[PDB]
């Protein structure tokens, strides 16, 4: 009846794939562990979008503190699955 | 309390306090279930005027518009028998002033 | 007002529970044909609350502004119902347009379903009491009120005016907001929004003062 | 009854909730145009309202300005 | 049990209340008044059975 | 279940407003890298809605014509 | 939530989340998605517009004036989302979490019922019972000797150890415990 | 409405008053008034228990409306005549209403027009 | 019912109209209370007439109890305990009886004002007129002695009264 | 009246010679035989009292006090065995003892017949409160909580026994009966002035009037849990019965000699509901609830109206029901965290769900909530002072205001929010507990069936 | 530029706003410093205790004792009889009371002047 139950790799699935509809990122060289500064050229504004997209696609807000702590898809899809209490 | 950084992991959540951190005077007013300090998109003596300025013309206005009532072209309403005096509480042992209403 | 309103609610949770528990309309986009019986529920109700002729409502908020009309009144009291009756068409729009027109603004991730027998007949039972309860009851209660038989044509049709100019007027703004145009709030915007400071004021100053002579004053 | 999210795409509707919206929304219609068919009084009015400037002196009982 | 519900939920209770409403209630004076049921020219009396006069020779404006 | 996520090249701004967006930030020498994101909410079922005198008159249709048989039917069967 | 905060906010800092916030802000007065996306790349564009100015006085000045363009112009009814502090939603499954340690104040009638579980429950006790020396052992070793400076805590760092005080972040009860 | 905005924005003595009313006598301009008939009784209205302000010149409409609706219970769409008569009847009561305001405000404009014109007279 | 005294608390002769039908519609009401008589009403005047005839086997009779007149206050001398025991227990029950007299008034009238309908300013203008001299009567017995209330000073608020009275009649037949 | 004195005497000898672990079943189960008793004393008559013997009597203003004395004890011995596990036998045999005592003084205090007796009555109840607050507090603060408590009352009722001995030698007696029958007025003296000063303090100390107050929030808050619920429940009631017995001498003198208690007592009432909307102690709080209340109860009887007397009963029976069963509510959290503060333990609804249902009922209870017999009695006194004068009102509705929302903030404040982290010693009800607020909390249900046992003679 | 927000009592200044955060100084650099310092130190020690499987009672906070002896038990010992003191004391003390006395007794005067006249209509006034 209510939302399924959220598992791992839909999380990755997902983040990858608002990563990937993206312009400033090519669907051929992005990876899970692929960093946003040191790889794939960007700056913090972008990195601040990436977290915004983030929110707005999986319907809870990051705080800023923790936010920026992040780099990679991975960190995210880490981020979001211990923070809605997903193990599988 | 309001204030206070919501997203910190503190040692109280609720009441949005450390453990060992000085604790106000006032802390039982300031509860955040309670007497709120955070900051407005107005500021105050703003909000202050716009409100009794308009609770005061909304007062005044009501006040012209009783003296400047609204009401229809027509005469006061008939009743036959008296004015209804009988129903309109009796006394049948004093014969009133028979008011007499006539057709126009 | 108890059929439709309570309408009016149960639609507005069906939204809620659809969106997974959001509230604001700005993130609520096209479920005009998302949710096809949640908004015809909701424009009923609407029509109803909004005075339209032959509603439930017709049968008694018509007849108040008639009565206010051919009274012995308060003239500022006249006309403040007469802009409630069109700020009351103003407001339906805004949930109409906000809601159910336009392209959506919620997640991706599409939880809409409205296919619980559950709320549908709860829904439906109401709706059917927002359409017919008016006439039903209206025609059948003995009269214990001396009508309005006499009036002007223009005056008769007063609260139809007012709120087709509210329906107009809320959808033209509405409507200017499609516009690539970007401008800061007005004093009157903010005034209304923020329910003209009452809350920020009398929830604050008289509280603090009550507390702070509670313990100054009366325990210390 | 067991419908599934979408992501994306609109979502997936039945043929029951379609009829009775539309079946409801034509009803209510119907209801309005039948009454204001059949009770267009309690919308226009019935009674005509007379005009005072058309009555005469001769109605209303007022002298002819001298006596 | 098709319809049990209706007899320990509805016809149960309407028996206590008719009971203590006939025989407790209206045992004193005053515990139960009616409204006087309305009288039209026209109508006749099950008490008494007079008959109320017509209403007066109508002007007839039609 | 067990439900599949749609491919991500499908979602294009041509035909949408975003192109006129795009269009309109071109003007002046910009460009928005999010559009592909927003596309999908004017691509499918969302195309095209309905608008506020369209929405209110939802059923005027079947109610007009249920309206006009029911008329005319009473009006031609009181004849007796 | 989840990161030690630092002793103050850099330049960077600040800006990144008068961006963020900026941007929140304007896409609650631009409702539709496309007209949020031309004012958010007007935004970018404004924000950009200084970014490589290397003198701080004037970038600092340029941030107080940003500071106060977005409190006059903020909305009064910004967007918040459900779960936030400030959402319709924030604090709403509070009273459904129930912190573990009421398990072991249970009937032995209740614990018949769940055997394998409150099994499971009482490994994990010895396992927090084996560990708390060893964590208490490298706080105090790796900690400076005039206190710590930081509420940062440090890992696990041979093979048999746990990072220390881990127990009440690790057996949280859930966002949803029913 | 017009007769608000000419009260007071013009001259409030040339229009009568809705609470001092009337102010002229009910045979000052007229050789012969009818008084007001009256068809329901007093005991008819009280047995009817019409309501106090419903005891006006239109109560045996009234009273003809409550039986009808009374007999004819179930069918809650056949007393529409008797209806329609009680309005009718409403209707000619208050234009009743409205020729008596309109001989009052034209008594008061004329009698001061008369007044002050043989007081023109008068000047000399 | 015979449970009480008709002339204490009088009643109208309650006229009803007869059930005239105008149309051809069968009426609702009248099924339901059919079913009503049939199904509800059948069995609960079983149900008593069973309970009577129980009660019919054991007929057993109490007593309104009467009491003497005893002498009153005015008669009792200054520091004469006993009779002044008495009288203050008479008194006492005077009172009581006085306001059980006022809660009959008032049942009158409140029967009266439900029963008339929506012309009782006019119907009962009797039970507005007992009332008002009943209270009258009682609030010139009762009205100013407070809590510690006794027969003496009542009998002293008596004194102040006809003292007062007595002077109004000197100076009004000075005039 | 010797059926309810003797069973209370011999409570103490079945006490002394019990077994150690089996006192506290013993004294229970006499004690709730005692009281089942004493229920048989609700049969009053109408018109005069019920005269036992030259040395007694009981009316229907005894009565319902008489029972409430009665039915406290076994439930202060249920509060009182759960922190005196640890004592020895006749420390235990002692506090039996102390408690029984008190309740024969009690007793024997309601049903006096004349006024010397019932003084002396009335203050011999010092001797065992004051030994209970003095010996088995917890805190250093109970020696000068009980040196307030003593000294407040002996100051207000030294003046009192002068007062009354005068009164039986201008007089000749200070039977009740005979002072009712043979009532006199006072001459507007000076003299006079100051007999009725020194009749009416004595019992305006332990209502306590405000500004006579302040040894109650010592005395309620270091007392021992069984101290503080006889403190509340029927001490302070002790007034009320004094001040509704002794003014049959005073009038007229009270109508003009009663301003400043009144005064006193309406402002006091708004000041003591500010006061405890903001208190760091639940203890405190309550014990501000009992001041707040009883000045209305000051009021009901300075006004001297019949309406404000059968008032003024319904709300001290109340009252004293339900401050029991706030402070029991109280000792449960307190003897669970060892801290009376009362931001410290906070979500307990999540934890002991029946408590927080105890709670919200007492505090529904607290706040007049119709129709509880607290609002009919605070109705009645408040229509009272509404025909004495109608600005009265204002001061009424402002502290009707202010108790229910104080009241619902100690609710909030103690069951809602989040749990505290760190008290994880947070044990389940005990059958006792439970109990202990059943049997508080259905008798005040129970009396709203028959509200007339409990308005007095003036009903 | 754009109209000032003023900071008030009860709608305080945003730190946003503030210009002590837009003008840093080493020494305030030290001073945040410190003060972090201070709260984590005082963290470690609250979580050692908190984390401990052993301890089973509720962790003692000398904040909130100090809090609640400072508000409760510590207020006399600090009273000092001052001009400022005794005013307000005797204001807040005395002045209601006597407010509250004269309109009662205006009230009550005046309603047994009416008594005293017959002239309060008080016809079905019986309970009192
Ligand atoms: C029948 C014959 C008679 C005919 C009668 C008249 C015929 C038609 C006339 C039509 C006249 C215009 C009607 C529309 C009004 C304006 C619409 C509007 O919203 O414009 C937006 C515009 C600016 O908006 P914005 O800030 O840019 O909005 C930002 C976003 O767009 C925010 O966007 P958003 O998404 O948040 O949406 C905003 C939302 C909300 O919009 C707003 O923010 C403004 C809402 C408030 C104005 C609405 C009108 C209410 C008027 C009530 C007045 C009561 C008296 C108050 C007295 C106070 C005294 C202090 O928009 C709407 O609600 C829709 C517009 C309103 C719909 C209803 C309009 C129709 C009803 C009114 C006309 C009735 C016609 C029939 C009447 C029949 C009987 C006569 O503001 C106005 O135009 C309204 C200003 C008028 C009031 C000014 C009051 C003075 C304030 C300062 C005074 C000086 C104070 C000095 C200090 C004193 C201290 C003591
Ligand atoms: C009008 C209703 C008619 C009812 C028919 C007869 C009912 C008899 C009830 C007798 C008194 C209840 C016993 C008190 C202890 C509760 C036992 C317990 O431990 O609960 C656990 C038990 C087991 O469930 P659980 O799973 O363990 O739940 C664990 C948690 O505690 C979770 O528990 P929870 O969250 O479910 O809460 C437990 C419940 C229990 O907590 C309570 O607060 C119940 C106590 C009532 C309110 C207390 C303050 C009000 C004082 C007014 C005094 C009125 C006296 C009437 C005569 C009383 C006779 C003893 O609290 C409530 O639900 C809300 C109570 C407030 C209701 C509204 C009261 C104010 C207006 C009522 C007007 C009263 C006059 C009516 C007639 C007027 C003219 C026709 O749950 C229950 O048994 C609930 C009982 C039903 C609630 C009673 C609410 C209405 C009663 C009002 C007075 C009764 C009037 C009777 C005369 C005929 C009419
Ligand atoms: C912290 C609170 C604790 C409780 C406090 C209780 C308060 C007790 C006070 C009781 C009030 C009545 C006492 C005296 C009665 C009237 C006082 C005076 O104001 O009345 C006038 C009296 O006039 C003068 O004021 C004389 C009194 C002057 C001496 C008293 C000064 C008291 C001021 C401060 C009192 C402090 C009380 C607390 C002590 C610790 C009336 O004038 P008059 O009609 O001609 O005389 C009537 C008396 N007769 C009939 C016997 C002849
Ligand atoms: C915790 C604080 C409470 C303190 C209360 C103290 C005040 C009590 C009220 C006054 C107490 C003393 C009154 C005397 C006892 C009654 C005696 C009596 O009634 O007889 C009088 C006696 O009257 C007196 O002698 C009065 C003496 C008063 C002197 C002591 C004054 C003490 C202070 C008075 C004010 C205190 C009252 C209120 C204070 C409240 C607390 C602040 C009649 O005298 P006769 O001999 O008959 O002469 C007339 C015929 N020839
Ligand atoms: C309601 C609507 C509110 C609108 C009001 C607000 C509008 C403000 C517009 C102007 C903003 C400014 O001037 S803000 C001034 C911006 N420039 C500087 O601060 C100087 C050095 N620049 C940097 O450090 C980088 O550009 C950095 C930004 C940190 C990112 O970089 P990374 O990510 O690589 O780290």
């Known amino acids: 009846s209510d939302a399924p139950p959220l598992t791992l790799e839909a999380i990755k699935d997902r983040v990858l794939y608002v990563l990937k509809l993206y312009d400033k990122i090519d669907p051929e060289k992005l990876s899970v562990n692929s960093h946003f500064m040191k790889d794939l050229g960007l700056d913090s504004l972008d990195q601040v979008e990436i977290i915004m997209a983030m929110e707005d696609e999986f319907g809870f807000e990051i705080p800023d503190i923790d936010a920026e702590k992040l780099m990679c898809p991975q960190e995210i899809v880490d981020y979001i699955a211990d923070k809605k209490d997903v193990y599988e | 309390q309001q204030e206070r950084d919501p997203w910190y992991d503190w040692d109280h959540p609720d009441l949005r306090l450390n453990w060992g951190e000085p604790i106000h005077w006032d802390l039982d007013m300031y509860i955040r279930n309670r007497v709120d300090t955070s900051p407005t998109p107005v500021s105050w003596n703003t909000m202050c005027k716009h409100l009794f300025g308009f609770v005061a013309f909304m007062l005044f206005m009501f006040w012209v518009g009783e003296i400047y009532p609204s009401y229809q072209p027509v005469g006061p309403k008939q009743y036959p028998y008296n004015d209804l005096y009988l129903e309109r509480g009796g006394d049948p042992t004093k014969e009133p002033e028979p008011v007499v209403h006539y057709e126009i | ?208 003062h009550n507390l702070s002579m509670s313990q100054k004053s009366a325990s210390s | 009854v067991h419908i599934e999210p979408r992501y994306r795409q609109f979502p997936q509707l039945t043929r029951s909730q379609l009829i009775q919206a539309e079946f409801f929304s034509a009803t209510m219609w119907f209801w309005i145009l039948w009454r204001f068919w059949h009770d267009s009084d309690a919308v226009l009015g019935h009674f005509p309202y007379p005009d005072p400037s058309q009555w005469t002196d001769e109605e209303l009982g007022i002298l002819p300005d001298d006596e | 049990r098709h319809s049990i519900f209706a007899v320990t939920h509805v016809l149960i209770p309407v028996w206590i209340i008719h009971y203590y409403l006939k025989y407790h209630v209206t045992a004193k004076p005053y515990t139960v008044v009616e409204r006087k049921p309305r009288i039209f020219p026209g109508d006749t009396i099950l008490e008494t059975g007079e008959v109320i006069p017509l209403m007066k020779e109508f002007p007839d404006q039609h | 279940s067990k439900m599949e996520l749609p491919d991500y090249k499908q979602w294009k701004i041509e035909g949408t407003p975003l192109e006129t967006v795009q269009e309109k930030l071109a003007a002046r020498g910009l460009r928005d890298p999010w559009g592909r994101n927003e596309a999908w909410r004017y691509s499918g079922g969302f195309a095209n809605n309905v608008s506020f005198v369209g929405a209110l008159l939802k059923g005027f249709k079947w109610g007009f014509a249920a309206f006009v048989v029911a008329v005319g039917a009473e009006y031609y069967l009181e004849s007796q | 939530a989840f990161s030690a905060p630092a002793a103050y906010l850099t330049h960077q800092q600040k800006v990144l989340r008068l961006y963020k916030r900026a941007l929140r802000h304007l896409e609650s007065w631009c409702v539709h998605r496309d007209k949020y996306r031309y004012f958010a790349c007007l935004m970018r564009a404004r924000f950009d517009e200084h970014k490589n100015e290397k003198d701080m006085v004037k970038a600092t000045q340029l941030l107080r004036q940003a500071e106060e363009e977005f409190w006059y112009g903020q909305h009064p009814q910004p967007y918040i989302f459900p779960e936030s502090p400030g959402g319709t939603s924030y604090e709403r499954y509070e009273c459904y979490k129930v912190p573990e340690w009421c398990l072991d104040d249970w009937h032995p009638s209740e614990k018949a019922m769940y055997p394998d579980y409150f099994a499971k429950r009482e490994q994990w006790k010895r396992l927090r019972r084996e560990s708390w020396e060893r964590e208490v052992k490298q706080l105090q070793e790796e900690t400076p000797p005039g206190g710590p400076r930081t509420e940062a805590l440090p890992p696990a760092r041979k093979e048999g150890d746990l990072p220390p005080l881990w127990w009440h972040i690790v057996t949280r009860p859930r966002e949803r415990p029913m | 409405g017009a007769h608000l905005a000419r009260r007071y924005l013009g001259d409030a003595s040339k229009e009568p008053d809705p609470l001092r009313m009337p102010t002229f006598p009910p045979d000052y301009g007229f050789p012969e008034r009818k008084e007001r008939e009256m068809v329901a009784t007093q005991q008819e209205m009280n047995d009817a228990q019409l309501m106090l302000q419903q005891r006006d010149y239109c109560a045996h409409y009234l009273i003809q409306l409550l039986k009808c609706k009374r007999d004819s219970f179930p069918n809650f769409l056949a007393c529409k005549h008797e209806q329609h008569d009680w309005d009718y009847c409403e209707h000619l009561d208050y234009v009743k209403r409205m020729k008596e305001f309109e001989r009052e405000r034209r008594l008061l404009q004329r009698k001061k027009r008369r007044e002050q014109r043989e007081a023109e007279m008068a000047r000399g | 019912p015979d449970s009480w005294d008709k002339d204490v608390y009088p009643e109208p002769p309650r006229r009803t109209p007869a059930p005239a039908p105008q149309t051809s519609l069968p009426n609702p009401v009248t099924y339901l209370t059919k079913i009503f008589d049939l199904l509800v009403d059948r069995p609960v005047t079983l149900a008593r007439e069973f309970i009577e005839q129980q009660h019919a086997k054991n007929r057993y009779y109490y007593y309104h109890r009467e009491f003497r007149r005893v002498p009153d206050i005015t008669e009792c001398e200054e520091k004469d305990i006993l009779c002044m025991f008495e009288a203050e227990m008479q008194w006492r029950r005077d009172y009581k009886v006085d306001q059980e007299i006022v809660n009959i008034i008032q049942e009158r009238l409140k029967a009266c004002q439900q029963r008339e309908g929506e012309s009782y300013r006019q119907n009962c203008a009797k039970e507005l007129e007992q009332f008002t001299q009943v209270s009258k009567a009682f609030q010139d017995r009762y009205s100013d002695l407070g809590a510690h209330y006794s027969a003496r000073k009542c009998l002293a608020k008596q004194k102040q009264r006809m003292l007062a009275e007595r002077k109004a009649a000197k100076e009004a037949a000075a005039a | 009246m010797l059926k309810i004195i003797i069973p209370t005497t011999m409570l103490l000898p079945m006490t002394w010679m019990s077994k150690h672990n089996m006192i506290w079943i013993n004294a229970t189960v006499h004690s709730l035989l005692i009281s089942l008793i004493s229920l048989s004393l609700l049969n009053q008559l109408g018109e005069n009292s019920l005269n036992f013997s030259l040395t007694f009597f009981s009316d229907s203003l005894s009565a319902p006090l008489l029972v409430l004395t009665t039915w406290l004890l076994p439930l202060m011995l249920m509060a009182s065995q759960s922190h005196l596990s640890k004592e020895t036998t006749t420390r235990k045999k002692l506090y039996i003892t102390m408690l029984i005592l008190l309740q024969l003084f009690l007793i024997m205090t309601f049903t006096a017949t004349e006024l010397i007796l019932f003084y002396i009555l009335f203050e011999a109840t010092l001797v065992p409160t004051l030994i209970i607050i003095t010996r088995w507090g917890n805190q250093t603060e109970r020696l000068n909580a009980g040196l307030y408590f003593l000294f407040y009352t002996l100051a ?238 204002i001061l009424m509705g402002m502290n009707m205001m202010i108790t229910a929302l104080y009241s619902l903030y100690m609710l909030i404040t103690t069951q809602r929010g989040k749990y505290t982290h760190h008290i994880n010693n947070i044990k389940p009800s005990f059958t006792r507990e439970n109990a202990l607020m059943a049997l508080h909390i259905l008798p005040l249900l129970l009396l709203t069936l028959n509200p007339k046992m409990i308005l007095g003679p003036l009903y | 530029s754009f109209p000032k927000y003023k900071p008030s009592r009860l709608a305080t200044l945003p730190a946003t706003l503030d210009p002590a955060e837009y003008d840093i100084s080493p020494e305030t650099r030290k001073a945040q410093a410190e003060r972090l310092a201070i709260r984590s130190r005082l963290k470690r020690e609250y979580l050692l205790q908190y984390n401990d499987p052993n301890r089973l009672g509720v962790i003692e906070d000398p904040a909130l004792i100090r809090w609640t002896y400072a508000r409760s038990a510590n207020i006399y010992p600090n009273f000092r009889p001052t001009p400022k003191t005794s005013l307000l004391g005797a204001l807040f003390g005395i002045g209601p009371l006597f407010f509250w006395y004269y309109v009662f007794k205006t009230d009550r005067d005046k309603k047994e002047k009416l008594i005293q006249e017959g002239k309060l209509d008080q016809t079905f006034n019986i309970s009192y």
Not at chain 3, 21 to 32: A, H, N, P, S
Not at chain 3, 183 to 202: D, E, V, W
Request: with cysteine; aromatic share 12%; net charge positive.
């Open chain 3, 1 to 208: 007002h108890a059929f439709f309103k309570a309408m009016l609610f149960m639609c507005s949770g069906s939204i809620i529970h659809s969106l997974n528990d959001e509230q604001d309309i700005r993130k609520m986009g096209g479920l005009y044909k998302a949710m096809p019986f949640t908004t015809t529920a909701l424009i009923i109700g609407s029509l109803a609350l909004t005075g339209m002729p032959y509603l439930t409502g017709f049968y008694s908020k018509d007849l108040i502004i008639e009565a206010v009309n051919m009274s012995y009144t308060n003239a500022w009291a006249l006309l403040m119902t007469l802009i409630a009756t069109s700020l009351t068409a103003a407001y339906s729009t805004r949930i109409i347009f906000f809601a159910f027109l336009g392209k959506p603004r919620f997640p991706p991730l599409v939880l809409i379903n409205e296919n619980n027998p559950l709320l549908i007949n709860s829904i439906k039972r109401l709706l059917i009491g927002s359409i017919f309860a008016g006439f039903i009851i209206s025609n059948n209660i003995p009269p214990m009120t001396v009508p309005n038989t006499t009036m002007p044509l223009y005056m008769k049709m007063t609260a139809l005016i007012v709120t087709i100019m509210g329906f107009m007027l809320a959808l033209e703004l509405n409507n200017t907001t499609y516009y690539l145009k970007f401008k800061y709030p007005s004093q009157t915007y903010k005034f209304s929004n923020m329910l003209g400071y009452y809350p920020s004021i009398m929830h604050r100053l008289p509280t603090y």
């Open chain 10, 156 to 393: 207000g009722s030294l003046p009192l026994l002068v007062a009354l001995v005068y009164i039986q030698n201008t007089t000749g007696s200070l039977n009740f009966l005979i002072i009712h029958y043979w009532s006199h007025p006072l001459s507007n003296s000076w003299s006079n002035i100051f007999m009725w000063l020194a009749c009416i303090m004595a019992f305006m100390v332990k209502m306590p009037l405000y500004g006579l107050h302040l040894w109650l929030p010592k005395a309620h808050v270091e007392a021992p849990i069984a101290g503080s619920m006889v403190l509340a429940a029927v001490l302070l009631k002790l007034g009320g019965y004094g001040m509704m017995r002794i003014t049959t001498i005073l009038n007229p003198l009270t109508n003009y000699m009663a301003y400043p208690f009144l005064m006193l007592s309406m402002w006091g009432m708004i000041m003591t509901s500010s006061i405890c909307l903001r208190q760091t102690d639940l203890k405190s709080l309550i014990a501000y609830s009992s001041v707040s209340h009883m000045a209305l109860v000051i009021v009901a009887i300075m006004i001297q109206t019949p309406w404000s007397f059968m008032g003024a009963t319904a709300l001290m029976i109340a009252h004293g029901l339900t401050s029991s069963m706030l402070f029991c509510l109280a000792n449960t959290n307190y003897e669970r965290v060892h801290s009376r503060t009362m931001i410290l333990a906070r979500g307990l609804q999540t934890l002991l769900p029946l408590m927080a249902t105890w709670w919200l009922v007492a505090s529904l209870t607290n706040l007049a909530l119709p129709p509880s017999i607290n609002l009919i009695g605070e109705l009645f006194i408040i229509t009272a002072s509404f025909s004495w004068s109608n600005i009265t009102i």
